Structure 1
Amino acid sequence: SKARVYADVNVLRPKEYWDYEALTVQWGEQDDYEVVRKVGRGKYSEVFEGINVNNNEKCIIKILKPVKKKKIKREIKILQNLCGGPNIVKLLDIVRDQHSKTPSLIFEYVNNTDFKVLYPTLTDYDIRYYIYELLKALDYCHSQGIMHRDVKPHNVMIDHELRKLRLIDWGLAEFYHPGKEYNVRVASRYFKGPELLVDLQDYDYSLDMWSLGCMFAGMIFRKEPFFYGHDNHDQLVKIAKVLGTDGLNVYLNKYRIELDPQLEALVGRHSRKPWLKFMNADNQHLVSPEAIDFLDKLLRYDHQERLTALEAMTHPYFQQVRAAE
Structure 2
Amino acid sequence: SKARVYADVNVLRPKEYWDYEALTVQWGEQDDYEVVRKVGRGKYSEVFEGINVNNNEKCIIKILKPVKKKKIKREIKILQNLCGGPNIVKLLDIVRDQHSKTPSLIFEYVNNTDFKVLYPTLTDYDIRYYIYELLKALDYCHSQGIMHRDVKPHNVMIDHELRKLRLIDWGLAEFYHPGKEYNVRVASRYFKGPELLVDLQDYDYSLDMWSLGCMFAGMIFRKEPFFYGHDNHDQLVKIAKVLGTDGLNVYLNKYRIELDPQLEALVGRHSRKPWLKFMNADNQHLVSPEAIDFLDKLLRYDHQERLTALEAMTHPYFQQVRAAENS
For residue 183 of structure 1, give the secondary structure of its aligned residue in structure 2: coil
- Alignment deviations for residues 257-299 of structure 1 (CA, whole Å, 9 cap, x no partner): 0100010000000000000000000000000000000000000
Q: Does residue 139 of the first structure (1) align with residue 139 of the second (2)?
A: yes
Q: Distance in 2 between matches of 1:116 and 1:234?
A: 24
Q: Return the offset for 1:214.
A: 0.2
Q: How far does the alpha carbon of each residue in 1:162-210 deviate from its partner, in whole angstroms, 9 at most, with x for none?
A: 0000000000000000010100000000000000000000000000000
| Runs of 4 or more consecutive aligned structure 1 residues displaced over 6 Å after TM superposition | none
Cα distance in 2 for partners of 1:252, 1:289 equals 29
The residue aligned with 1:223 is 223
Q: Deviations over 1:119-172 (max 9, x none)?
A: 000000000000000000000000000000000000000000000000000000
SS for the counterpart of 2:55 is coil
Specify the SS of the correspondent of 1:306: coil
Is the partner of 1:171 in helix, strand or coil? Answer: helix
Match of 1:89 in 2: 89
Q: State the Cα distance separating 1:254 from its structure 2 match.
A: 0.2
State the Cα RMSD in Å.
0.3
**Residue 208 of structure 1: aligned partner:** 208
> How far, CA to CA, are the matches of 1:291 and 1:107 in structure 2?
33
What whole-Å deviation, never above 9, does each CA across 1:82-123 have from its counterpart, x for those lacking one? 000000000000000000000000000001000000000000
Identity rate, percent: 100
- Provide the secondary structure at the position in 2 that maps to 1:60: strand
Aligned equivalents of 2:11 and 2:219: distance in 1?
Answer: 37
TM-score of the two chains, using structure 1 as the length reference: 1.00
Q: Distance in 1 between matches of 2:50 and 2:278?
A: 42
Q: 1:223-252: per-residue Cα shift (whole Å, max 9, x none)? A: 000000000000000000000000000000
Partners of 2:18 and 2:105 in 1: CA distance: 20
Q: For 2:111 and 2:180, how far apart are their aligned partners in 1?
A: 38
In 1, the alpha carbon distance for the partners of 2:196 and 2:236 equals 10
SS of the equivalent of 1:324 reads: helix
Q: Which consecutive unaligned segments of at least 5 residues does structure 1 have?
A: none
Distance, in Å, in 1 between the alignment partners of 2:23 and 2:41 is 27
Residue 126 of structure 1 corresponds to which residue in structure 2? 126
Q: How many residues align?
A: 325
- Counterpart Cα distance in 1 of 2:7 and 2:299: 22
Hey, what's the Cα distance between the residues in 2 that align with 1:65 and 1:6?
A: 33
State the alpha-carbon separation in 2 of the partners of residues 16 and 246 from structure 1.
Answer: 44
How far did 1:67 drift? Answer: 1.3
Equivalent-residue separation in structure 1 for 2:52 and 2:79 (angstroms): 20
> What is the match of residue 98 of structure 1?
98
Q: Distance in 1 between matches of 2:137 and 2:59?
A: 21
Secondary structure of 2:273 counterpart: coil
SS at match of 1:158: strand
Separation of aligned partners in 2, 1:237 and 1:158? 32
User: What secondary structure does 1:285 align onto?
Assistant: helix
Distance 2:306 2:125 in 1: 23
The 5 A counterparts of 1:28-39 are: 28-39=28-39
**How many angstroms apart in 2 are the aligned matches of 1:234 and 1:85?**
36
Per-residue Cα deviation, 1:12-62 (whole angstroms, up to 9, x for no partner) = 000010000010000000000000000001000000000000000000000
Q: Which deviations, in whole Å up to 9, do the C-alpha atoms of 1:51-86 show, x marking residues without a partner?
A: 000000000000000011000000000000000000
TM-score (norm 2): 0.99
